[PDB]
Amino acid sequence: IELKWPKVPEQLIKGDKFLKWEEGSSGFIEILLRVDPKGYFLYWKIEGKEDTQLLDLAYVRDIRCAKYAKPPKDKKIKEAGTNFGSSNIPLQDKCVTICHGYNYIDLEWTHLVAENSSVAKKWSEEVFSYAYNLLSLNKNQLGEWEKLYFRLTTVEMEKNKIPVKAIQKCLSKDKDDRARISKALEKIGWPSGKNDAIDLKAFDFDTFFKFYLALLERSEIEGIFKELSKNKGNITTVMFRDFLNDMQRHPSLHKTLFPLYTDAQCEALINDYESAVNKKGKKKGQLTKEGLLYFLMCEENNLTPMHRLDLGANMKLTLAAYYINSSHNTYLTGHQLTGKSSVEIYRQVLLTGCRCLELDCWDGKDGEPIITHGFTMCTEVLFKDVVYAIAESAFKVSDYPVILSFENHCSVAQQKLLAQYCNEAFGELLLDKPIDGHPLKPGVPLPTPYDLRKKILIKNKKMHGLTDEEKKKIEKEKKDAGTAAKEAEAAEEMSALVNYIQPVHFTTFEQAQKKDRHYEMSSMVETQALNKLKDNPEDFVDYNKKQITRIYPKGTRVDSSNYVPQIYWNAGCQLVALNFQCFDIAMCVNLGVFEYNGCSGYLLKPEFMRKLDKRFDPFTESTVDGVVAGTIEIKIISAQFLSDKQISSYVEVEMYGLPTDTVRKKFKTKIIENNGMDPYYDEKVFVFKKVVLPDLAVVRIIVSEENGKFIGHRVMPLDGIKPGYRHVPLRNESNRPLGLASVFAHIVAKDYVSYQSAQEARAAALCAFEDDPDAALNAAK
Ligand SMILES: [Ca+2]
């Protein structure tokens, strides 16, 4: 595994001097900016401010320097910045710009001037790597506890002392919870008064874990300890080994590729945990209740399968073999008809690892092409600005190829400019010619993502007996397509940039097979794709083994709502385009699944979906030959640190995959009232008895306030899911960590131990994906 934890240079730990300034103010202040030794926070002090200022790198989106930074325009700031460090270094070369946000639509900005260009560059490269570190983003609850520990001992520390005030503010705003915190500090033997402070010497991490033990009532651990110890006293080495190999391990996990734990390893692990919790009170090969809880929260018990998180997939198959992270009308940051267009949104979408973007190009009044949603009240942006934005951000988080979907409405003169600016903005990144071994002839497969690393592909038109019932459906498809229904003819300069991703008019699956052109593809509005899926589902899957389908939402979704992408991934569609600005279930799931494989934006389709000789109906309700069906059981036990106030909460568990495996609005826990710190649900297990196609499915935990307000979630693909007792750190809608907020659950995952037309039956099957499946099903009949 190539993934590494953040490694923070001593230079950044000590810190560097910067001038900090804000838009809309003429002020500036020199700060000493620092990173904690674990790469979790940027922090700095402002003279006269009580609290140390910080940025939680969990929500940092980008950091830019030099030509990509935003230099100050205010006269007084510019003069100060020019004089800061060396005046012989141009102002902009010293500038560093940071953008941060809980989600990527609502950004805030921090602007800095370094003393020189080397410092600006070093900080930009280092901080970006920490913000996008997959291990840091996936750490278990003990890791999040350690993050809090490092905040307290670096950011909040005052003259080698940790103020109690700082401990309380980091955990809760509630009076009762603050009392619990004080009592817990008292129980440990630390000062607990409102205005007291703890010495750094006495504030070690292992004692900080003893504070965790004193604070939360993890009532469930007693019964679980009794279970695993067989009620015989402490958990012995052999009992722990069997726990790890039987309960915490998928029974079908390959025993050579993923070796079983041994006695010697388990004795050693027990020593690790017992050392941390009991020190010389530890007994050889004997794990205590507190030692068990430590394990359950530590990296050894991380729910995330590291071999899947790492960029470990085979990237050397045809492009058609992958699910590719895709954005629709990417320029829009809100409503389809009344919202704003943006340049920065392109950078933000690419930073999630999204690989396929859309650019709706129109003639600008001044002779310069623009991007906007035609015939609406949306604002416009310059095409040139967008492509320079794409060129900046395209390969910052993924090396794998980007596809730009052009919806081209420009005159020939402005299309010349589109082509010109693509060339000038992208340079070498632009794939303007076929590569060796892959000419554009029939029968020649598409290149692999590996072949096309660091390349931008252009999807644009190249140079130029139906029945009445069929013609009417086609008319509806065209209407639902909106502005995409009619583009301009391709100019030769734009045509010239198109090769492997050539959009063509779809006729039939029979015709696509006959032509045998792997570089021809179709971009279908959801209405068209649904007609094909319902008419010829098996043929759709077969088409997608060699050729690419892009899907995009119909025009009636004016609020930028999304379909659930599994609907189309189930048919092997590769470019399932979503509105990234709408954080509905579809986007939550999309960002969840594409975190895996190194956040590359590419996921390899299941083998059965790539086998040319296999026929597969995604509407099947029975087991598929060659694919082992699964059973999943999820028991929601408790949650930790859901909120800084006393909230009432519940937990839901959903599954999305094949229609027959998709379960929404079925499973909901009881409400635990007035407890945001350690609610204990102890809910009866939720059973997903028969999962027909596990590798197309994900299970999802969603935590909400009683009034339905979203708190956090976690998406767990069944491919590689780890069973047993797991802490599940929660994520926000953009799939960034909430922090300490976690659900504790038990997971069973094992092999399953045993209408008037097809179209109508298939439409009914698709009701399972809706926000209210029963109501959708009732409305159809
Ligand atoms: Ca469009």
Side-chain angles (χ1 to χ4, degrees), residues 194-216:
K194 188 196 284 285
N195 308 306
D196 287 334
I198 309 179
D199 291 349
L200 180 57
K201 294 159 188 182
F203 202 81
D204 60 283
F205 182 70
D206 286 346
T207 309
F208 194 59
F209 186 74
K210 207 180 164 182
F211 166 62
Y212 181 99
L213 298 178
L215 181 56
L216 288 77

PDB file of all heavy atoms in Angstrom, residues 194-216:
ATOM      1  N   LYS A 194     -13.281  26.024  36.257  1.00  0.00           N
ATOM      2  CA  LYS A 194     -13.580  26.833  35.070  1.00  0.00           C
ATOM      3  C   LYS A 194     -12.349  27.570  34.527  1.00  0.00           C
ATOM      4  O   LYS A 194     -12.158  27.645  33.312  1.00  0.00           O
ATOM      5  CB  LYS A 194     -14.687  27.846  35.401  1.00  0.00           C
ATOM      6  CG  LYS A 194     -15.237  28.626  34.206  1.00  0.00           C
ATOM      7  CD  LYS A 194     -16.025  29.860  34.647  1.00  0.00           C
ATOM      8  CE  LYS A 194     -17.406  29.506  35.190  1.00  0.00           C
ATOM      9  NZ  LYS A 194     -18.361  29.142  34.106  1.00  0.00           N
ATOM     10  N   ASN A 195     -11.520  28.100  35.429  1.00  0.00           N
ATOM     11  CA  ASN A 195     -10.361  28.915  35.052  1.00  0.00           C
ATOM     12  C   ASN A 195      -9.007  28.241  35.330  1.00  0.00           C
ATOM     13  O   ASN A 195      -7.969  28.910  35.346  1.00  0.00           O
ATOM     14  CB  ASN A 195     -10.422  30.262  35.782  1.00  0.00           C
ATOM     15  CG  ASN A 195     -11.759  30.965  35.605  1.00  0.00           C
ATOM     16  OD1 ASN A 195     -12.228  31.172  34.485  1.00  0.00           O
ATOM     17  ND2 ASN A 195     -12.377  31.341  36.715  1.00  0.00           N
ATOM     18  N   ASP A 196      -9.016  26.927  35.543  1.00  0.00           N
ATOM     19  CA  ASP A 196      -7.784  26.171  35.772  1.00  0.00           C
ATOM     20  C   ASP A 196      -7.092  25.809  34.452  1.00  0.00           C
ATOM     21  O   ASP A 196      -7.627  26.046  33.369  1.00  0.00           O
ATOM     22  CB  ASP A 196      -8.073  24.896  36.576  1.00  0.00           C
ATOM     23  CG  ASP A 196      -8.379  25.177  38.042  1.00  0.00           C
ATOM     24  OD1 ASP A 196      -7.922  26.210  38.577  1.00  0.00           O
ATOM     25  OD2 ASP A 196      -9.071  24.347  38.669  1.00  0.00           O
ATOM     26  N   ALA A 197      -5.890  25.252  34.566  1.00  0.00           N
ATOM     27  CA  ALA A 197      -5.123  24.790  33.413  1.00  0.00           C
ATOM     28  C   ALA A 197      -4.256  23.598  33.811  1.00  0.00           C
ATOM     29  O   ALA A 197      -3.771  23.531  34.942  1.00  0.00           O
ATOM     30  CB  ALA A 197      -4.264  25.914  32.868  1.00  0.00           C
ATOM     31  N   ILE A 198      -4.071  22.663  32.882  1.00  0.00           N
ATOM     32  CA  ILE A 198      -3.314  21.439  33.138  1.00  0.00           C
ATOM     33  C   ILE A 198      -1.910  21.545  32.547  1.00  0.00           C
ATOM     34  O   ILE A 198      -1.745  22.023  31.428  1.00  0.00           O
ATOM     35  CB  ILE A 198      -4.012  20.206  32.524  1.00  0.00           C
ATOM     36  CG1 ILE A 198      -5.486  20.155  32.942  1.00  0.00           C
ATOM     37  CG2 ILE A 198      -3.292  18.927  32.934  1.00  0.00           C
ATOM     38  CD1 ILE A 198      -6.245  18.988  32.351  1.00  0.00           C
ATOM     39  N   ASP A 199      -0.907  21.090  33.294  1.00  0.00           N
ATOM     40  CA  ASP A 199       0.474  21.106  32.815  1.00  0.00           C
ATOM     41  C   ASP A 199       0.654  20.128  31.656  1.00  0.00           C
ATOM     42  O   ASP A 199       0.095  19.028  31.672  1.00  0.00           O
ATOM     43  CB  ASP A 199       1.452  20.741  33.942  1.00  0.00           C
ATOM     44  CG  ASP A 199       1.538  21.807  35.024  1.00  0.00           C
ATOM     45  OD1 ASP A 199       1.015  22.924  34.827  1.00  0.00           O
ATOM     46  OD2 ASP A 199       2.136  21.525  36.082  1.00  0.00           O
ATOM     47  N   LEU A 200       1.439  20.535  30.659  1.00  0.00           N
ATOM     48  CA  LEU A 200       1.750  19.681  29.511  1.00  0.00           C
ATOM     49  C   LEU A 200       2.336  18.345  29.951  1.00  0.00           C
ATOM     50  O   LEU A 200       2.019  17.308  29.367  1.00  0.00           O
ATOM     51  CB  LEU A 200       2.730  20.381  28.561  1.00  0.00           C
ATOM     52  CG  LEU A 200       3.142  19.601  27.303  1.00  0.00           C
ATOM     53  CD1 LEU A 200       1.916  19.205  26.477  1.00  0.00           C
ATOM     54  CD2 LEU A 200       4.108  20.412  26.465  1.00  0.00           C
ATOM     55  N   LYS A 201       3.185  18.382  30.979  1.00  0.00           N
ATOM     56  CA  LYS A 201       3.809  17.177  31.539  1.00  0.00           C
ATOM     57  C   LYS A 201       2.766  16.137  31.937  1.00  0.00           C
ATOM     58  O   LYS A 201       2.908  14.958  31.613  1.00  0.00           O
ATOM     59  CB  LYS A 201       4.654  17.526  32.770  1.00  0.00           C
ATOM     60  CG  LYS A 201       5.871  18.393  32.480  1.00  0.00           C
ATOM     61  CD  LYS A 201       6.357  19.111  33.732  1.00  0.00           C
ATOM     62  CE  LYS A 201       7.448  20.116  33.397  1.00  0.00           C
ATOM     63  NZ  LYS A 201       7.978  20.802  34.608  1.00  0.00           N
ATOM     64  N   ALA A 202       1.724  16.583  32.636  1.00  0.00           N
ATOM     65  CA  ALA A 202       0.664  15.696  33.121  1.00  0.00           C
ATOM     66  C   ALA A 202      -0.368  15.355  32.043  1.00  0.00           C
ATOM     67  O   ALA A 202      -1.211  14.481  32.246  1.00  0.00           O
ATOM     68  CB  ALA A 202      -0.033  16.321  34.326  1.00  0.00           C
ATOM     69  N   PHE A 203      -0.299  16.044  30.905  1.00  0.00           N
ATOM     70  CA  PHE A 203      -1.287  15.907  29.837  1.00  0.00           C
ATOM     71  C   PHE A 203      -0.754  15.023  28.701  1.00  0.00           C
ATOM     72  O   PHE A 203      -0.543  15.485  27.581  1.00  0.00           O
ATOM     73  CB  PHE A 203      -1.669  17.298  29.322  1.00  0.00           C
ATOM     74  CG  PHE A 203      -2.996  17.352  28.616  1.00  0.00           C
ATOM     75  CD1 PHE A 203      -4.178  17.436  29.340  1.00  0.00           C
ATOM     76  CD2 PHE A 203      -3.064  17.349  27.231  1.00  0.00           C
ATOM     77  CE1 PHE A 203      -5.407  17.502  28.692  1.00  0.00           C
ATOM     78  CE2 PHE A 203      -4.290  17.410  26.579  1.00  0.00           C
ATOM     79  CZ  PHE A 203      -5.461  17.490  27.314  1.00  0.00           C
ATOM     80  N   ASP A 204      -0.533  13.747  29.010  1.00  0.00           N
ATOM     81  CA  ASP A 204      -0.118  12.754  28.011  1.00  0.00           C
ATOM     82  C   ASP A 204      -1.339  12.117  27.343  1.00  0.00           C
ATOM     83  O   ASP A 204      -2.431  12.121  27.908  1.00  0.00           O
ATOM     84  CB  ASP A 204       0.745  11.666  28.660  1.00  0.00           C
ATOM     85  CG  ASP A 204       0.017  10.924  29.767  1.00  0.00           C
ATOM     86  OD1 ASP A 204      -0.106  11.480  30.882  1.00  0.00           O
ATOM     87  OD2 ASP A 204      -0.437   9.791  29.524  1.00  0.00           O
ATOM     88  N   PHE A 205      -1.149  11.552  26.153  1.00  0.00           N
ATOM     89  CA  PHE A 205      -2.271  10.982  25.402  1.00  0.00           C
ATOM     90  C   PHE A 205      -2.956   9.807  26.113  1.00  0.00           C
ATOM     91  O   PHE A 205      -4.181   9.690  26.074  1.00  0.00           O
ATOM     92  CB  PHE A 205      -1.856  10.554  23.989  1.00  0.00           C
ATOM     93  CG  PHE A 205      -2.996  10.005  23.180  1.00  0.00           C
ATOM     94  CD1 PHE A 205      -4.014  10.842  22.740  1.00  0.00           C
ATOM     95  CD2 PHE A 205      -3.077   8.648  22.890  1.00  0.00           C
ATOM     96  CE1 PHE A 205      -5.086  10.339  22.009  1.00  0.00           C
ATOM     97  CE2 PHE A 205      -4.145   8.139  22.158  1.00  0.00           C
ATOM     98  CZ  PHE A 205      -5.150   8.989  21.716  1.00  0.00           C
ATOM     99  N   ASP A 206      -2.182   8.937  26.756  1.00  0.00           N
ATOM    100  CA  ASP A 206      -2.779   7.764  27.403  1.00  0.00           C
ATOM    101  C   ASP A 206      -3.684   8.157  28.568  1.00  0.00           C
ATOM    102  O   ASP A 206      -4.721   7.533  28.786  1.00  0.00           O
ATOM    103  CB  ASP A 206      -1.706   6.758  27.834  1.00  0.00           C
ATOM    104  CG  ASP A 206      -1.109   6.003  26.654  1.00  0.00           C
ATOM    105  OD1 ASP A 206      -1.693   6.049  25.551  1.00  0.00           O
ATOM    106  OD2 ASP A 206      -0.053   5.356  26.827  1.00  0.00           O
ATOM    107  N   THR A 207      -3.307   9.206  29.291  1.00  0.00           N
ATOM    108  CA  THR A 207      -4.179   9.778  30.316  1.00  0.00           C
ATOM    109  C   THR A 207      -5.368  10.493  29.668  1.00  0.00           C
ATOM    110  O   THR A 207      -6.477  10.476  30.207  1.00  0.00           O
ATOM    111  CB  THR A 207      -3.413  10.750  31.223  1.00  0.00           C
ATOM    112  OG1 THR A 207      -2.233  10.103  31.712  1.00  0.00           O
ATOM    113  CG2 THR A 207      -4.277  11.187  32.396  1.00  0.00           C
ATOM    114  N   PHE A 208      -5.140  11.117  28.513  1.00  0.00           N
ATOM    115  CA  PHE A 208      -6.239  11.698  27.734  1.00  0.00           C
ATOM    116  C   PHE A 208      -7.249  10.623  27.302  1.00  0.00           C
ATOM    117  O   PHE A 208      -8.449  10.892  27.252  1.00  0.00           O
ATOM    118  CB  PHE A 208      -5.716  12.473  26.513  1.00  0.00           C
ATOM    119  CG  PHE A 208      -6.750  13.368  25.866  1.00  0.00           C
ATOM    120  CD1 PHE A 208      -7.366  14.381  26.593  1.00  0.00           C
ATOM    121  CD2 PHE A 208      -7.095  13.206  24.532  1.00  0.00           C
ATOM    122  CE1 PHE A 208      -8.319  15.213  26.000  1.00  0.00           C
ATOM    123  CE2 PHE A 208      -8.046  14.039  23.930  1.00  0.00           C
ATOM    124  CZ  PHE A 208      -8.658  15.038  24.665  1.00  0.00           C
ATOM    125  N   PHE A 209      -6.777   9.412  27.004  1.00  0.00           N
ATOM    126  CA  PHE A 209      -7.696   8.302  26.722  1.00  0.00           C
ATOM    127  C   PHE A 209      -8.458   7.877  27.978  1.00  0.00           C
ATOM    128  O   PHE A 209      -9.637   7.542  27.902  1.00  0.00           O
ATOM    129  CB  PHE A 209      -6.983   7.092  26.112  1.00  0.00           C
ATOM    130  CG  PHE A 209      -7.931   6.006  25.676  1.00  0.00           C
ATOM    131  CD1 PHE A 209      -8.710   6.168  24.537  1.00  0.00           C
ATOM    132  CD2 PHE A 209      -8.074   4.841  26.426  1.00  0.00           C
ATOM    133  CE1 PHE A 209      -9.602   5.175  24.131  1.00  0.00           C
ATOM    134  CE2 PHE A 209      -8.972   3.839  26.027  1.00  0.00           C
ATOM    135  CZ  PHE A 209      -9.733   4.012  24.880  1.00  0.00           C
ATOM    136  N   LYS A 210      -7.792   7.901  29.128  1.00  0.00           N
ATOM    137  CA  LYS A 210      -8.461   7.631  30.408  1.00  0.00           C
ATOM    138  C   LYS A 210      -9.568   8.677  30.668  1.00  0.00           C
ATOM    139  O   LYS A 210     -10.583   8.378  31.290  1.00  0.00           O
ATOM    140  CB  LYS A 210      -7.441   7.605  31.559  1.00  0.00           C
ATOM    141  CG  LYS A 210      -7.860   6.744  32.748  1.00  0.00           C
ATOM    142  CD  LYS A 210      -6.809   6.745  33.866  1.00  0.00           C
ATOM    143  CE  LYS A 210      -7.399   6.215  35.170  1.00  0.00           C
ATOM    144  NZ  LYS A 210      -6.427   6.239  36.307  1.00  0.00           N
ATOM    145  N   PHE A 211      -9.371   9.899  30.172  1.00  0.00           N
ATOM    146  CA  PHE A 211     -10.409  10.934  30.215  1.00  0.00           C
ATOM    147  C   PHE A 211     -11.621  10.532  29.363  1.00  0.00           C
ATOM    148  O   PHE A 211     -12.758  10.684  29.803  1.00  0.00           O
ATOM    149  CB  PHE A 211      -9.825  12.288  29.782  1.00  0.00           C
ATOM    150  CG  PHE A 211     -10.856  13.345  29.469  1.00  0.00           C
ATOM    151  CD1 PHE A 211     -11.740  13.788  30.440  1.00  0.00           C
ATOM    152  CD2 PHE A 211     -10.903  13.931  28.211  1.00  0.00           C
ATOM    153  CE1 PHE A 211     -12.673  14.778  30.153  1.00  0.00           C
ATOM    154  CE2 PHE A 211     -11.831  14.919  27.917  1.00  0.00           C
ATOM    155  CZ  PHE A 211     -12.718  15.343  28.889  1.00  0.00           C
ATOM    156  N   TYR A 212     -11.371  10.011  28.162  1.00  0.00           N
ATOM    157  CA  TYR A 212     -12.433   9.444  27.318  1.00  0.00           C
ATOM    158  C   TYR A 212     -13.222   8.377  28.083  1.00  0.00           C
ATOM    159  O   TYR A 212     -14.452   8.394  28.081  1.00  0.00           O
ATOM    160  CB  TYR A 212     -11.854   8.831  26.029  1.00  0.00           C
ATOM    161  CG  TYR A 212     -12.894   8.245  25.088  1.00  0.00           C
ATOM    162  CD1 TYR A 212     -13.352   8.964  23.992  1.00  0.00           C
ATOM    163  CD2 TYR A 212     -13.408   6.964  25.290  1.00  0.00           C
ATOM    164  CE1 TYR A 212     -14.304   8.431  23.128  1.00  0.00           C
ATOM    165  CE2 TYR A 212     -14.362   6.423  24.435  1.00  0.00           C
ATOM    166  CZ  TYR A 212     -14.806   7.163  23.353  1.00  0.00           C
ATOM    167  OH  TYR A 212     -15.751   6.644  22.500  1.00  0.00           O
ATOM    168  N   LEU A 213     -12.505   7.460  28.733  1.00  0.00           N
ATOM    169  CA  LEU A 213     -13.136   6.392  29.516  1.00  0.00           C
ATOM    170  C   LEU A 213     -13.998   6.958  30.645  1.00  0.00           C
ATOM    171  O   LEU A 213     -15.085   6.447  30.915  1.00  0.00           O
ATOM    172  CB  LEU A 213     -12.083   5.442  30.099  1.00  0.00           C
ATOM    173  CG  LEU A 213     -11.211   4.659  29.113  1.00  0.00           C
ATOM    174  CD1 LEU A 213     -10.194   3.793  29.867  1.00  0.00           C
ATOM    175  CD2 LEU A 213     -12.072   3.808  28.199  1.00  0.00           C
ATOM    176  N   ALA A 214     -13.505   8.011  31.294  1.00  0.00           N
ATOM    177  CA  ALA A 214     -14.237   8.690  32.366  1.00  0.00           C
ATOM    178  C   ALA A 214     -15.424   9.519  31.868  1.00  0.00           C
ATOM    179  O   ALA A 214     -16.379   9.733  32.617  1.00  0.00           O
ATOM    180  CB  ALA A 214     -13.291   9.582  33.163  1.00  0.00           C
ATOM    181  N   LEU A 215     -15.360   9.999  30.626  1.00  0.00           N
ATOM    182  CA  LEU A 215     -16.382  10.901  30.096  1.00  0.00           C
ATOM    183  C   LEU A 215     -17.597  10.166  29.553  1.00  0.00           C
ATOM    184  O   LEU A 215     -18.719  10.399  30.002  1.00  0.00           O
ATOM    185  CB  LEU A 215     -15.806  11.799  28.995  1.00  0.00           C
ATOM    186  CG  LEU A 215     -16.795  12.800  28.377  1.00  0.00           C
ATOM    187  CD1 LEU A 215     -17.407  13.684  29.461  1.00  0.00           C
ATOM    188  CD2 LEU A 215     -16.118  13.647  27.310  1.00  0.00           C
ATOM    189  N   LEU A 216     -17.380   9.299  28.568  1.00  0.00           N
ATOM    190  CA  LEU A 216     -18.494   8.619  27.913  1.00  0.00           C
ATOM    191  C   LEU A 216     -18.879   7.366  28.678  1.00  0.00           C
ATOM    192  O   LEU A 216     -18.021   6.678  29.230  1.00  0.00           O
ATOM    193  CB  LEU A 216     -18.169   8.267  26.456  1.00  0.00           C
ATOM    194  CG  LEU A 216     -18.128   9.467  25.508  1.00  0.00           C
ATOM    195  CD1 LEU A 216     -16.837  10.227  25.697  1.00  0.00           C
ATOM    196  CD2 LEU A 216     -18.298   9.043  24.060  1.00  0.00           C
TER     197      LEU A 216
END
